[PDB]
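User: Thanks for the earlier help. One more: Glycosyl hydrolase family 71. Can you show the sequence and predicted structure together?

Assistant: Of course, both are below.
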Amino acid sequence: GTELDYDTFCFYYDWYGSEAIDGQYRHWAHAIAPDPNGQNPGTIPGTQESIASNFYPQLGRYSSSDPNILTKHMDMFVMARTGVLALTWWNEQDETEAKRIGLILDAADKKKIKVCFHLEPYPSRNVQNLRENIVKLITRYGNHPAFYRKDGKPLFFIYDSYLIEPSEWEKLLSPGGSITIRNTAYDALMIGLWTSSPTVQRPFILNAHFDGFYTYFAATGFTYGSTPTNWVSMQKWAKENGKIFIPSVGPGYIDTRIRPWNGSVIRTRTDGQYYDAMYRKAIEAGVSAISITSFNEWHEGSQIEPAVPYTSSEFTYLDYENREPDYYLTRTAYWVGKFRESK
Ligand SMILES: OC[C@H]1C[C@H]2N[C@H]2[C@@H](O[C@H]2O[C@H](CO)[C@@H](O)[C@H](O)[C@H]2O)[C@@H]1O
């Protein structure tokens, strides 16, 4: 009852910097989003006192490229029993991205953690450059011992997959598609983002030839897909149609340091009871895999990574009290155990 679970995927963000490694506190400093409804909202400067999160990391303003931080993160995945790190991927095409991905794979392998990619909506993303990038990632990293495979296939999560028409997806994902990956060296499990109602999403997923779907959002009720009372029926549909459903569960949500106008999306943690309810619903739906939003999306307040109390002259941060800083790692391990009992 301590082993890693390789059907548990934790969304991981590698965009943080520190002075020690990067020469800058990247992402800890962040622009404030204007209200979508002549605004000069400003920027959070990423100083010790004022970072782009409502919470404060136990590890401080860390770099995602610091091998010592990465070691600690992998030890945290081990504590949480989460066997797969689902790495945000933005197609930066820069040496710093390449170095960091290699460091993450190397650190993961030391702890028997696996890595898969979460393909983000990069500029001009389309099925042709997606194919090229899938080929690139499999070619570059597919022989790394930490690269994730399920039944011989890589797995990719595709964020905002609805931004691309099913007629385009079918070219890549139907066995007869014009630029198919099916039956090729680059075949993979492609997990699209289920957002809205079944009348829209069922034909989208079928016509796009996705292997499965996930829901991402940590805030219950943000979308149809992130409303856990829909998960039993979503799983039934998935099983009937040979699709893999990977619901996303998270411990809470708050992004109001970077999106001050987005308070209606706040979901309170209630000393773990929110996380418990969401994780229970995923397990009760009878799914074969679960995704966790998030390890370390600090901007969105969905992180399970340890956080500490902090009051600065500029902001009084939220924290996990009356739970301890590692509570969400140990509670994740509890739920992984419950999930494994159900498999
Ligand atoms: O990983 C999927 C999305 C999840 C959530 N992290 C956001 C999205 O990224 C956007 O918002 C963050 C702030 O929360 C910005 O730092 C990014 O630049 C922006 O793309 C993820 O795409």
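User: Great, one quick takeaway?

Assistant: Residues 95-110 form the longest helix (16 residues).
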